[PDB]
């Protein structure tokens, strides 16, 4: 189990090679924040594979110089490169060479003979090398090694310092010059240390903090201050000073983050009537099919869930859950009755009687063909139902053929009477109330639409969330967006009036499209953040002041000025000291 502990101030390192002097110099650079937890390890009875994250701190407490190795990378599959580092008999030995790794890669110790630990040639860290893109060669003590990869550069820093503490990272400040830069170009998501096996060490993780360094005359960083650590240190980053003297400094701002979002669209969003297509009492027959315009409305497929439904459902263009997710343009649901097998014959590229003659659909048609038995209804003896048994071409896209004209087989003109091979091309289906599955009529419907590209007539039902109050939320109403605190407001909006507004021309009230009511809006919070402090010469204790909020969204004293955190109201009244606002003067003493 990882035993954490308190980083204190370690992990500062010369962010560049520049020299400076006596100059507090802000810098925004991946560091190890102060007082963070470090994931602390041992060597006893301990070198797991860890995430590399963005970078890594590291240390060890070496009286024994045992922790000699590092293996970095992502896969560690020997296929990519991996760094390797070995510090042995004062000769540093370094490689990016590629090789494949042990269950427990390490170095050996054969305890106590002429060669102490022996087992230099232990060297079971790995299978064997493969490809090499680089080479270089060269509790009292502590070795702090920062590692980070940026722009082909892995990078190292170091310090070797004497200490005496057995337990933990000594509390004191010193910072880490670079040793190296390696222009390797690996990607590294993980790494593992390596050891000489027969001793503590640590890990941090670097974060994009911004610190205030302080160089000294010789140019050595003698101190640092984390900006984000805590108010007193949000100040010192403002002034560029370690000394922060009395009075109220304004560091930063605070904007209450929104809860989630609110999407709201006018109830019912009207409707698209596929019923009077599908449930129309007298269908036009297949041979003359309805073409029926449907518009300004919302994909209505929620009526089509409850019914005996439809002997088939085929709608060509796009996914049937894009019925209700995708709006269409020219929407014609084609109301007609066909004989049973004729659902095949209604489809693009169909050779067939329906297709080639009475009801013909395009190869480019995007939409439906849907069957159901009307033998349960349309059957009688009904010979009014009819079809084009023969015609001299295919119908043009969505075209109909109405012809009662004589079908003329021979060059002998029939002239409106019957004769030898004189035909009336249209013919009827006798419906026999004993009709079976092959003989049953199928009422069949076809939705004309472009897919996209023209206005939404049949639309998709658009998801309107629920409504929350008194709580900062993002929102959209009816395409009006913004972010606010939606409350209940007596603002009597006009019947046709949508928004409200305000002298500054800033959206204010709205009316809930579904249920009609006057919601205010209200900005989120803002406020500055002022940091009251008695001069750092006196204390380190600061009392933040959140200007101009009510104390929630944050020993708290709500003021006329704002939400004051960290000071103790006092009935007594003394002369002013660090004037805050509205007559409230903080001061340090008991």
């Amino acid at each position: 189990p990882p035993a954490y502990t308190n980083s204190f101030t370690r992990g500062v390192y010369y962010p560049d090679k520049v020299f400076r002097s006596s100059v507090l110099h802000s810098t925004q650079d991946l560091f190890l924040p102060f007082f963070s937890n470090v994931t602390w390890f041992h060597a006893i009875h301990d070198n797991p594979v860890l995430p590399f994250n963005d970078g890594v701190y590291f240390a060890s407490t070496e009286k024994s110089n045992i922790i000699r190795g590092w293996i970095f990378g992502t896969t560690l599959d020997s296929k990519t490169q991996s760094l390797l580092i070995v510090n042995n008999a004062t000769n540093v030995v370094i490689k990016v060479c590629e090789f494949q790794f042990c269950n427990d890669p390490f170095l050996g110790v054969y305890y106590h003979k002429n060669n102490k630990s022996w087992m230099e040639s232990e060297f079971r860290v790995y299978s064997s090398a493969n490809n090499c893109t680089f080479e270089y060669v060269s509790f009292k003590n502590l070795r702090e090694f920062v590692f980070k990869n940026i722009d082909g550069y892995f990078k190292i820093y170091s310090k070797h310092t004497p200490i005496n503490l057995v337990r933990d990272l000594p509390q004191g400040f010193s910072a880490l010059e670079p040793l190296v830069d390696l222009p390797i170009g690996i990607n590294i998501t993980r790494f593992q240390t390596l050891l000489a096996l027969h001793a503590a060490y640590y890990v941090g993780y670097l974060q994009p903090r911004t610190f205030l360094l302080k160089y000294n005359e010789n140019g050595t960083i003698t101190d640092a201050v984390d900006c984000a650590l805590d108010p007193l240190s949000e100040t010192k980053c403002t002034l560029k000073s370690f000394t922060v003297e009395k009075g109220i400094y304004q560091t930063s701002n605070f904007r209450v983050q929104p809860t989630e979002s609110i999407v709201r669209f006018p109830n019912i969003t009207n409707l698209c009537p596929f019923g009077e297509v599908f449930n129309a009492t007298r269908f036009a027959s297949v041979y003359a099919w309805n073409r029926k315009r449907i518009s300004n409305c919302v994909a209505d497929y929620s009526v089509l869930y409850n019914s005996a439904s439809f002997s088939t459902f085929k709608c060509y263009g796009v996914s049937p859950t894009k019925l209700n997710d995708l709006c269409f343009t020219n929407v014609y649901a084609d109301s007609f009755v066909i004989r049973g097998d004729e659902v095949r014959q209604i489809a693009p590229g169909q050779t067939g009687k329906i297709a080639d003659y009475n009801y013909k659909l395009p190869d480019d048609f995007t939409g439906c063909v849907i069957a159901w038995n009307s033998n349960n209804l349309d059957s009688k003896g009904n010979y009014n139902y009819l079809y084009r048994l023969f015609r001299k071409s295919n119908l043009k896209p969505f075209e109909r053929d109405i012809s009662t004209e004589i079908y003329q087989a021979g060059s002998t003109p029939c002239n409106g009477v019957e004769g030898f091979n004189c035909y009336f091309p249209l013919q009827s289906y006798g419906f026999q109330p004993t009709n079976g599955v092959g003989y049953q009529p199928y009422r069949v419907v076809v939705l004309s639409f472009e897919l996209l590209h023209a206005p939404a007539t049949v639309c998709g039902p658009k998801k309107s969330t629920n409504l929350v109050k008194n709580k900062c939320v993002n929102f959209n109403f009816n395409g009006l967006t913004g972010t606010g605190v939606l409350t209940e407001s007596n603002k009597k909006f006009l019947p046709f009036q949508q928004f409200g507004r305000d002298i500054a021309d800033t959206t204010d009230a709205v009316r809930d499209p579904q249920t009609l009511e006057i919601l205010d809006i209200t900005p989120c919070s803002f406020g500055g953040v002022s940091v009251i402090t008695p001069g750092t010469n006196t204390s380190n204790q600061v009392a933040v002041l959140y200007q101009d909020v009510n104390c929630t969204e944050v020993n708290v004293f709500q003021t006329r000025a704002g939400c004051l955190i960290g000071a103790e109201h006092v009935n007594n009244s003394y002369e002013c000291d660090i004037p805050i606002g509205a007559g409230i003067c903080a001061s340090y003493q008991t």
């Epitope: 088939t312 049937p320 095949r344 489809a347």
Partner: antibody, heavy 119, light 106 residues
Framework: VQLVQSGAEVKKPGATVKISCKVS????????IHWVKQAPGKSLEWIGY????????SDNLKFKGAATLTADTSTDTAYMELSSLRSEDTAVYYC?????????????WGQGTTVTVSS | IVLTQSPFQSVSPKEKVTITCRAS??????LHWYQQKPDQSPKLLIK???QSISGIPSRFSGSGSGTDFTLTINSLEAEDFGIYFC?????????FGQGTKLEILK
């Protein structure tokens, strides 16, 4: 006569599985393909029919995977892409040879494709 | 437009069993019976509810009356029994029987 499916697909929930139904032994263009789901120890469940010549996807919605049935006419292989995977979609996905016209019969099928949808 | 089966039927060899497919409201005179062996693709026994695909035992028959469609087996063999399905026809997607595991005693 022959319908061969892509092997078992193990995904995390919310991911996508697409499954190949490879036709052989008959004419692909003359037969729709039914796509049949059997949840383990549960009943037969039909996700949709496809057309060889066209976009003939119908979708039983019920369980919604944003599914679309694509048929590859060169290789006679209908795909079922099942997205938005859920641990209940875990099942053996059969593809079933369908008639190209109204008489819906599935005489011959794939071998079934187990999909284990889990974290 | 959903159909109902009996979850289980236990019979003895040579005895006649009938497994029902009961569809809600309207029914379609076509139906399709399936014998699913354990861990194996169901196989269509009965087509249009009146017909066997070729090679299927003559003891495998089907029918329907009212809203019910029967899977009727005469003179069972202990090799025969298996999980049985009926498939709705038309009315949008074919709603397959919940399944019936047939047991044969003796």
């Amino acid at each position: 006569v022959q319908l061969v499916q892509s092997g078992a697909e193990v995904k995390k929930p919310g991911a996508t599985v697409k499954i190949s139904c490879k036709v052989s032994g008959y004419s692909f263009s003359n037969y729709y393909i039914h796509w049949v789901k059997q949840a383990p120890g549960k009943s037969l469940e039909w996700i949709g029919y496809i057309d060889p010549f066209n976009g003939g996807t119908s979708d039983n919605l019920k369980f919604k995977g944003a599914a679309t049935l694509t048929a590859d006419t060169s290789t006679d292989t209908a795909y079922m892409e099942l997205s938005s995977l859920r641990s209940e979609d875990t099942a053996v996905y059969y593809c079933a040879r369908s008639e190209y016209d109204p008489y819906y019969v599935m005489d011959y099928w794939g071998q079934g494709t187990t999909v284990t949808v889990s974290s | 437009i959903v159909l109902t089966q009996s979850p289980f039927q236990s019979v003895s060899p040579k005895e006649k069993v009938t497994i029902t497919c009961r569809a809600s409201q309207s029914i379609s005179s076509n139906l399709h019976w399936y014998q699913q062996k354990p861990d194996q693709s169901p196989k269509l026994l009965i087509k249009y509810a009146s017909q066997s695909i070729s090679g299927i035992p003559s003891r495998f028959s089907g029918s329907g009356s009212g809203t019910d469609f029967t899977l009727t087996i005469n003179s069972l063999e202990a090799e025969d029994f298996g999980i049985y399905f009926c498939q709705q026809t038309n009315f949008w997607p074919y709603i397959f029987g919940q399944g019936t595991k047939l047991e044969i005693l003796k």
